[PDB]
Design an enzyme around this catalytic site. Sequence first.
Site, PDB file in Angstrom:
ATOM      1  N   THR A   1       4.016  -6.919   4.243  1.00  0.00           N
ATOM      2  CA  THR A   1       3.780  -7.073   2.813  1.00  0.00           C
ATOM      3  C   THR A   1       4.858  -6.361   2.005  1.00  0.00           C
ATOM      4  O   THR A   1       5.456  -6.947   1.095  1.00  0.00           O
ATOM      5  CB  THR A   1       2.388  -6.554   2.453  1.00  0.00           C
ATOM      6  OG1 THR A   1       2.097  -6.857   1.082  1.00  0.00           O
ATOM      7  CG2 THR A   1       2.296  -5.063   2.676  1.00  0.00           C
TER       8      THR A   1
ATOM      9  N   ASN B   1       2.768  12.348  -0.137  1.00  0.00           N
ATOM     10  CA  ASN B   1       3.252  11.591  -1.284  1.00  0.00           C
ATOM     11  C   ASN B   1       3.651  12.512  -2.424  1.00  0.00           C
ATOM     12  O   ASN B   1       4.621  12.240  -3.141  1.00  0.00           O
ATOM     13  CB  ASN B   1       2.193  10.595  -1.749  1.00  0.00           C
ATOM     14  CG  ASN B   1       1.883   9.545  -0.706  1.00  0.00           C
ATOM     15  OD1 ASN B   1       0.773   9.485  -0.179  1.00  0.00           O
ATOM     16  ND2 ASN B   1       2.864   8.704  -0.406  1.00  0.00           N
TER      17      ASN B   1
ATOM     18  N   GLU C   1      24.922   5.954 -14.409  1.00  0.00           N
ATOM     19  CA  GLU C   1      25.888   6.833 -13.751  1.00  0.00           C
ATOM     20  C   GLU C   1      25.415   7.224 -12.354  1.00  0.00           C
ATOM     21  O   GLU C   1      25.400   8.391 -11.971  1.00  0.00           O
ATOM     22  CB  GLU C   1      26.140   8.066 -14.610  1.00  0.00           C
ATOM     23  CG  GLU C   1      26.851   7.774 -15.920  1.00  0.00           C
ATOM     24  CD  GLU C   1      27.067   9.021 -16.755  1.00  0.00           C
ATOM     25  OE1 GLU C   1      26.552  10.092 -16.370  1.00  0.00           O
ATOM     26  OE2 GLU C   1      27.749   8.929 -17.797  1.00  0.00           O
TER      27      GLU C   1
ATOM     28  N   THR D   1       3.335   4.619  13.367  1.00  0.00           N
ATOM     29  CA  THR D   1       1.957   4.154  13.439  1.00  0.00           C
ATOM     30  C   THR D   1       1.842   2.738  13.984  1.00  0.00           C
ATOM     31  O   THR D   1       1.024   2.482  14.874  1.00  0.00           O
ATOM     32  CB  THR D   1       1.306   4.221  12.056  1.00  0.00           C
ATOM     33  OG1 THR D   1       1.305   5.576  11.590  1.00  0.00           O
ATOM     34  CG2 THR D   1      -0.124   3.706  12.115  1.00  0.00           C
TER      35      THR D   1
ATOM     36  N   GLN E   1       0.825  -1.202   0.000  1.00  0.00           N
ATOM     37  CA  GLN E   1       0.000   0.000   0.000  1.00  0.00           C
ATOM     38  C   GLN E   1       0.860   1.253   0.000  1.00  0.00           C
ATOM     39  O   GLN E   1       0.579   2.208  -0.733  1.00  0.00           O
ATOM     40  CB  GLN E   1      -0.939  -0.003   1.202  1.00  0.00           C
ATOM     41  CG  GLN E   1      -2.011   1.057   1.138  1.00  0.00           C
ATOM     42  CD  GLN E   1      -2.676   1.281   2.472  1.00  0.00           C
ATOM     43  OE1 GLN E   1      -2.466   2.303   3.116  1.00  0.00           O
ATOM     44  NE2 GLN E   1      -3.481   0.321   2.898  1.00  0.00           N
TER      45      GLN E   1
HETATM   46  N1  LIG Z   1       4.849   8.258   2.970  1.00  0.00           N
HETATM   47  C1  LIG Z   1       3.761   7.551   3.252  1.00  0.00           C
HETATM   48  N2  LIG Z   1       3.854   6.458   4.086  1.00  0.00           N
HETATM   49  C2  LIG Z   1       2.755   5.733   4.381  1.00  0.00           C
HETATM   50  C3  LIG Z   1       1.525   6.079   3.847  1.00  0.00           C
HETATM   51  N3  LIG Z   1       0.612   5.199   4.300  1.00  0.00           N
HETATM   52  C4  LIG Z   1       1.237   4.308   5.101  1.00  0.00           C
HETATM   53  N4  LIG Z   1       2.564   4.631   5.169  1.00  0.00           N
HETATM   54  C5  LIG Z   1       3.609   3.912   5.915  1.00  0.00           C
HETATM   55  O1  LIG Z   1       3.303   2.534   5.932  1.00  0.00           O
HETATM   56  C6  LIG Z   1       3.594   1.979   7.194  1.00  0.00           C
HETATM   57  C7  LIG Z   1       2.632   0.842   7.508  1.00  0.00           C
HETATM   58  O2  LIG Z   1       2.400   0.044   6.367  1.00  0.00           O
HETATM   59  P1  LIG Z   1       1.124   0.335   5.434  1.00  0.00           P
HETATM   60  O3  LIG Z   1       1.348   1.597   4.642  1.00  0.00           O
HETATM   61  O4  LIG Z   1      -0.129   0.435   6.271  1.00  0.00           O
HETATM   62  O5  LIG Z   1       1.018  -0.884   4.392  1.00  0.00           O
HETATM   63  P2  LIG Z   1       2.122  -2.043   4.278  1.00  0.00           P
HETATM   64  O6  LIG Z   1       3.425  -1.639   4.917  1.00  0.00           O
HETATM   65  O7  LIG Z   1       2.322  -2.346   2.816  1.00  0.00           O
HETATM   66  O8  LIG Z   1       1.472  -3.307   5.023  1.00  0.00           O
HETATM   67  P3  LIG Z   1      -0.044  -3.745   4.721  1.00  0.00           P
HETATM   68  O9  LIG Z   1      -0.944  -2.596   5.089  1.00  0.00           O
HETATM   69  O10 LIG Z   1      -0.400  -4.954   5.543  1.00  0.00           O
HETATM   70  O11 LIG Z   1      -0.229  -4.068   3.264  1.00  0.00           O
HETATM   71  C8  LIG Z   1       3.466   3.119   8.186  1.00  0.00           C
HETATM   72  O12 LIG Z   1       4.458   3.021   9.180  1.00  0.00           O
HETATM   73  C9  LIG Z   1       3.682   4.367   7.362  1.00  0.00           C
HETATM   74  O13 LIG Z   1       4.958   4.885   7.643  1.00  0.00           O
HETATM   75  C10 LIG Z   1       1.421   7.173   3.012  1.00  0.00           C
HETATM   76  O14 LIG Z   1       0.331   7.480   2.538  1.00  0.00           O
HETATM   77  N5  LIG Z   1       2.543   7.909   2.713  1.00  0.00           N
HETATM   78 MG   LIG Z   2      -1.976  -4.605   4.187  1.00  0.00          MG
END
Ligand SMILES: Nc1nc2c(ncn2[C@@H]2O[C@H](COP(=O)(O)OP(=O)(O)OP(=O)(O)O)[C@@H](O)[C@H]2O)c(=O)[nH]1
Ligand SMILES: [Mg+2]
Lengths: 99, 61, 71, 430, 439, 51
Positions: free
Chosen positions: E145, E228, E254, E179, E11
């Site tokens: 993930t 983002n 490079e 988080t 995600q």
């Molecule tokens: N820069 C940025 N980081 C994000 C965002 N959403 C989540 N994160 C980061 O993602 C971490 C947690 O993972 P998730 O984004 O919820 O998703 P994941 O790591 O792929 O794991 P799953 O949710 O199980 O698929 C958090 O600690 C955030 O730092 C976002 O919109 N922008």
């Molecule tokens: Mg997930």
Amino acid sequence: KGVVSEQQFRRVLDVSNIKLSEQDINLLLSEFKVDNIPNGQVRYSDFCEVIDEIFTKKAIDKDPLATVTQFQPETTLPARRYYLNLTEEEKGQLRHLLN
Amino acid sequence: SKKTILSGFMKNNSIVGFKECLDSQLQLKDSKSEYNDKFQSKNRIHRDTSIFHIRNKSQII
Amino acid sequence: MKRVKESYFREHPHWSDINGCSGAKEFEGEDLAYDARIKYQKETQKQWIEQQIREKKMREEAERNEERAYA
Amino acid sequence: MREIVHIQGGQCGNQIGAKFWEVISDEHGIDPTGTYHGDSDLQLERINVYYNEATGGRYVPRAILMDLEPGTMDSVRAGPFGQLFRPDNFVFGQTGAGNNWAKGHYTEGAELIDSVLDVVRKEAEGCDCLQGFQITHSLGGGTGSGMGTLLISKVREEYPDRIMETFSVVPSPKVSDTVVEPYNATLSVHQLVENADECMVIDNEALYDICFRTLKLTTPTYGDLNHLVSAAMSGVTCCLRFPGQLNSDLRKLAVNLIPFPRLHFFMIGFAPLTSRGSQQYRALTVPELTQQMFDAKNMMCAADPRHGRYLTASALFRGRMSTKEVDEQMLNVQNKNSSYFVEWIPNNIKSSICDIPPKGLKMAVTFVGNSTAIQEMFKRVAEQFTAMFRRKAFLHWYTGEGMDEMEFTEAESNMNDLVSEYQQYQDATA
Amino acid sequence: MREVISIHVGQGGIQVGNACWELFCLEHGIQPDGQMPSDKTIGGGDDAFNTFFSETGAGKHVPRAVFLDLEPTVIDEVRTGTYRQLFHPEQLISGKEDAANNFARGHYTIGKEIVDLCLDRIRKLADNCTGLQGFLVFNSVGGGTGSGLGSLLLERLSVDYGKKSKLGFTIYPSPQVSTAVVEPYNSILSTHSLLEHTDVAVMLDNEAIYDICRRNLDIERPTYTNLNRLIAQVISSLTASLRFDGALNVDITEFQTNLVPYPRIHFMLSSYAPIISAEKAYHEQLSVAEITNSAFEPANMMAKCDPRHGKYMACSMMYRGDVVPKDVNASIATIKTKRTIQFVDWCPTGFKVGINYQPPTVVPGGDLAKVMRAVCMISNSTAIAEVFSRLDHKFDLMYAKRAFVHWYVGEGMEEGEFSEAREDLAALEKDYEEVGIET
Amino acid sequence: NSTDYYTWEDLNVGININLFERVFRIVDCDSFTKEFFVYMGKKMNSPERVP
Ligand SMILES: Nc1nc2c(ncn2[C@@H]2O[C@H](COP(=O)(O)OP(=O)(O)OP(=O)(O)O)[C@@H](O)[C@H]2O)c(=O)[nH]1
Ligand SMILES: [Mg+2]
Ligand SMILES: Nc1nc2c(ncn2[C@@H]2O[C@H](COP(=O)(O)OP(=O)(O)OP(=O)(O)O)[C@@H](O)[C@H]2O)c(=O)[nH]1
Ligand SMILES: Nc1nc2c(ncn2[C@@H]2O[C@H](COP(=O)(O)OP(=O)(O)O)[C@@H](O)[C@H]2O)c(=O)[nH]1
Ligand SMILES: [Mg+2]
């Protein structure tokens, strides 16, 4: 430079297999030979371009509107230039015999 | 509208101090090289004997 | 700062203007424009007198309109 | 042949030159854009002195413009004939000195000598046989006189044999225009005597003195005062460019106006100068010119020449005139005024003639004479300086930039010595 | 004849990956449906769409990406939004059961049922392009993930394709604000796999950007949508030279040639400037000399790591805009003069300068305001030893009593795996110090 | 090798532009071109198909 000896000019015509008449040979010299009492330095720059004008119209660029000549059996047709056209005075008698 | 028109494609691809040198210094004939001024002048069997000495202070150059 | 004017009134003369002046005979300092300049300037001064007085009262009357309305 | 270069620095020095190159320019017919349109052949025979040649035939004065503030040289260009000066020669800083002599001679002026001196050494070397340098500067501004004098000292150490001319403008005490003037004049004047070979004094008060009462122009302006000085300055080198009865270059005038090494201060003026409303009553004949050239009011220096005794005098007449009436009229002025003339040097006047008169004029003359009257100017400057020094007022500026108080005392003494010694002769008798 | 394949996993990658396309989509005159309008064409040069797009023969184009995620909710959003027409239908490969932050879940048990399909899709896109320069991989470490899938996919890629270059734009956990509650566990494991399989990986910790947003934009209410976007601009900066004219360009190849002194030390942190809102973006000149000052200001660093505690190895700092080369010379010299930036002893000069002309674009509805000059920096500094420093310490506390451990041992992974990661991270700690010691 | 530059008011359909001594014949106008010319207020010429 843009000028070659008059005699060397005769060399190309004989080698090129293109045959010309003596009086004609005078005609080219009078029109191309450098304007001088003695001989030498006949400039082919003017001659070469015009004679070659029938191939591709060199220097076509800088004039988009112009379109080169297509040339066809009608290009050697002007080679027919001759005094035999007098029959054009009255070709009816020619028509009568032909039909 | 003095310096705001700046653009990267204009600043970089426009030479500044290396364009043609201003006039009054281009006055030279590329076709005229030495050995052509005098030897090829023509020559003459009889020269023009006339000479003159103008009654003005000759310019110093 | 720079000095792009000889005085407050006349710009430096046109390059064709100085034909003589090699010897001290032509100066442009003898004025002979002094009389003409004063006459035009004094009339202009009165113009700002009238113009400003008109604005001042207009402010006053509107100001006095503030008090009359208050009544 | 025997040409001279020009080095004008400081604002007051800059403005004076701003017209000088316009004055001589109209004399030889040099157009503002650099192409020649002069009429007489003679207008080009001896142009080498002040002008140099370039490809394309355009002519460029070989002058040097210098100052520490942008205003002076970013403005002179916008006026007429402002494009003649070559762009390279300009030398200017970024700060300015603010009338503080210290800012102009030790901190900012000295640091900027390297560039300015470089151009001079390149320009002078191009000469065939140089004659010398002429410097114009004002003594009322710290930045001007500050690095103005330092340039003179450096030059003398490498060109010992070329003459050195300087036309300084010192502040008269009646019309006051700068408060720190006494410090600048007293210290600056010390350097000029030791190094400068010749310097002709000029005072603003006279310029107004000349303007109101003889040219009768109703409203004078800074431009007018510049004009008279320029014309007079053209006279000193008048015959150097043209043939004459008795050619007399700068070195010739020196040999007849400096009795001793340390008395090299003169006073000059120009004549005739008739009012726009008087040119129809005066008559132009040689006797008229001679009388006015000696009249007190005409001298550019506020010091009346009649308060002392003359030591040497030179007159460079202009135009065609009977050498009889130059000698006889000149001899006329030296027998009816025997009280005003030193006695031990007989016939203390020089004569010269040039064959080309100023355009639009028939007869004219310029004077150069070292008179004891100049003793008055040093006293007035000296008196004020001692008064302001007894309380060390305004001295904190100079003492805070590496300059010590001893130098001021040395400057006073040599200037103090000059006044007394300069008068050891006006009382001297044979 | 140059191209790059984009991979978004997780995600965090998807949402940021979603952001990176609106910036890319606009930058070449392609609307959401993918069809170039027959009118109002702004296209400079040709083939510019080729670096990331492939022609369909007539009309629209396609993006070069493959989205992977086991959670349908995140993926299903895109297929129902306004960019449905853009992506190819059968490349948004996704599963049914969520990873549930169990790093083993996406790497030993649940992942193995999708990794096979993901590679096959990669095979199809490999043949379409000609000379692929490298891949861009985005993923958030703080999730199983992203961490689980990322390692598996990268290891397969390193053997399937070989010497081609790959870049990873991760997002590591912050020092104090995070988080999740299990983020420290999956951080150590991830770096173990990503250290031995990636060429260049940058730091994008969330907490730093929050400070980045506040100081300049003056907005106290930021959300991931704004977050983002800022990464989008840096994404554009790193690739400005592959699809545009310039005076002195840089190829992606490079980067493994100027910014990684040794194979192990290849973590670098970025910084962006200027970012000035429309309300204040037009009251200053934005000179090249002053802008680069903001580049090295300690606070604006892409990550929450103060560079002042270490050395500066090499900064391949890029340019876009109206920059003349002569000005750049004055900017590099001034930086060396300052005493607050101190380099290593064995790197006399550590700058690889790049320039591109196409100025940054403005995404409608966002926060950024238009500017002339922009410089994005990819700088490698010894300060990065800190980020690994705190991560290792956090791991120690939780594994002393080995809490949360038993949610992993049930996923088939051996017990010794957890300890092994410590060897990789810990050994990495001793290497930085050895790089910086003066000889 | 000159110091004079084009201003958009110079281009037009049917006229000859000079570009490195090569002669160009700009023939057709895109849909978006016409409006800007009409908006600014300089006449526009009738098109013809390219031979
Ligand atoms: N820069 C940025 N980081 C994000 C965002 N959403 C989540 N994160 C980061 O993602 C971490 C947690 O993972 P998730 O984004 O919820 O998703 P994941 O790591 O792929 O794991 P799953 O949710 O199980 O698929 C958090 O600690 C955030 O730092 C976002 O919109 N922008
Ligand atoms: Mg997930
Ligand atoms: N009879 C006559 N005497 C002249 C003439 N010109 C100059 N003199 C004399 O020269 C004296 C002035 O000094 P000069 O002898 O001329 O000095 P000079 O001729 O310049 O000699 P140098 O200065 O060495 O070049 C006068 O006293 C005159 O007696 C002239 O034309 N005729
Ligand atoms: N001859 C002349 N002198 C001037 C003029 N204007 C100013 N001055 C003199 O210049 C002096 C000031 O010099 P200044 O500008 O301070 O010189 P600086 O120190 O080099 O900047 C004053 O005392 C004036 O007497 C002018 O128009 N003509
Ligand atoms: Mg002599």
